[PDB]
Amino acid sequence: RDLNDAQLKFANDVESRIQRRIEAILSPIVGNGNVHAQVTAQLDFANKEQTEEHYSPNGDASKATLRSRQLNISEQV
Amino acid sequence: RDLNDAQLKFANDVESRIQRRIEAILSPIVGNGNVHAQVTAQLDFANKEQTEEHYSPNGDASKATLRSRQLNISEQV
Amino acid sequence: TQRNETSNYEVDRTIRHTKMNVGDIERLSVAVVVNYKTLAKPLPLTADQMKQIEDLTREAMGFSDKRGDTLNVVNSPFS
Amino acid sequence: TQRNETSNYEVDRTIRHTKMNVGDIERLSVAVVVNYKTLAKPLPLTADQMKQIEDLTREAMGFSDKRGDTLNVVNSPFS
Structure with a gap:
């Protein structure tokens, strides 16, 4: 209930802010009382944790970062 | 009971908000008393936890991120 | 001939832990x-005015048709 | 012939731990x-004025169409 009313008041606050700004940026052009605006905004309220972990591609040997190597080559004829 | 009445009052609150906004955005065009609106909204009240875990496709060797390798190649003729 | 290959890869990742909201539309x-x-x-109001x-x-x-919102507007003489 | 190769690589990295905001648009x-x-x-206002x-x-x-914002502006006589 109280969280719901807090969400509704916060939504109405953001609507009032954007509505007042649209009324202020347009009224010097068309006149003081010749415009109305209404704002309906959907908000999110879900806590969203995230953890990316990128890696860099090292397929090509010209940008590989080796640590060891054990290259053996035999041959006969 | 009390949770049910809280859900009903919160639904009625959101209905009142959207109804007042539709009455405010339309009445300057058609007139002060020539419009009515009614809003019926279905709400959710189920707590929904979620845990995605994406991975990135590394089938192609040109974007693979190797850590080891042990390539042996024999041959005879 | 022969070709033995062992590999070990490394994987990118993402973990999203979303606790959704109670009371949305x-x-x-x-x-x-x-x-x-x-x-x-x-x-009656003309078709452009109704539109x-x-x-x-x-x-x-x-209005968001992903949620399946429905709107119906009619014009009629009052009483 | 023969060719045995063992390798050990080293990997670059990034870790982003983002706790998103509660209350955004x-x-x-x-x-x-x-x-x-x-x-x-x-x-009525002309088309350049409406534009x-x-x-x-x-x-x-x-306005950001990534979020799918919608704007509609109309011109009509008042009452």
Whole structure:
């Protein structure tokens, strides 16, 4: 209930802010009382944790970062 | 009971908000008393936890991120 | 011939832990009535006026057809 | 012939631990009405004036079509 009313008041606050700004940026052009605006905004309220972990591609040997190597080559004829 | 009445009052609150906004955005065009609106909204009240875990496709060797390798190649003729 | 290959890869990742909200909107259903316009009386609003009124009501709804919102606007003489 | 190769690589990395914000905007929907201009009365605003008013309202919105914001501006005589 109280969280719901807090969400509704916060939504109405953001609507009032954007509505007042649209009324202020347009009224010097068309006149003081010749415009109305209404704002309906959907908000999110879900806590969203995230953890990316990128890696860099090292397929090509010209940008590989080796640590060891054990290259053996035999041959006969 | 009390949770049910809280859900009903919160639904009625959101209905009142959207109804007042539709009455405010339309009445300057058609007139002060020539419009009515009614809003019926279905709400959710189920707590929904979620845990995605994406991975990135590394089938192609040109974007693979190797850590080891042990390539042996024999041959005879 | 022969070719033995052992590999070890490394994987990118993402973990999203989302606790959704209790009390959001799943669907809107808005029914709008408008009166006829009486000038000097039986004059319905024209199709362009009804279309732009539908536009305004759709935008003031926050209309989103992903949620399946429904809007119906009619014009009729009042009483 | 033969060729045995063992390797050990080393990997670059990145770890982003992002705790997102509670209370941000997902979508804006803005409906704007403007009156006709009365000079000496039935004069609608021209198409360039409506276009630049749409420009100003879009920029004052913080309009971002990634979020799917919707704007509709109409011009009509008041009452």
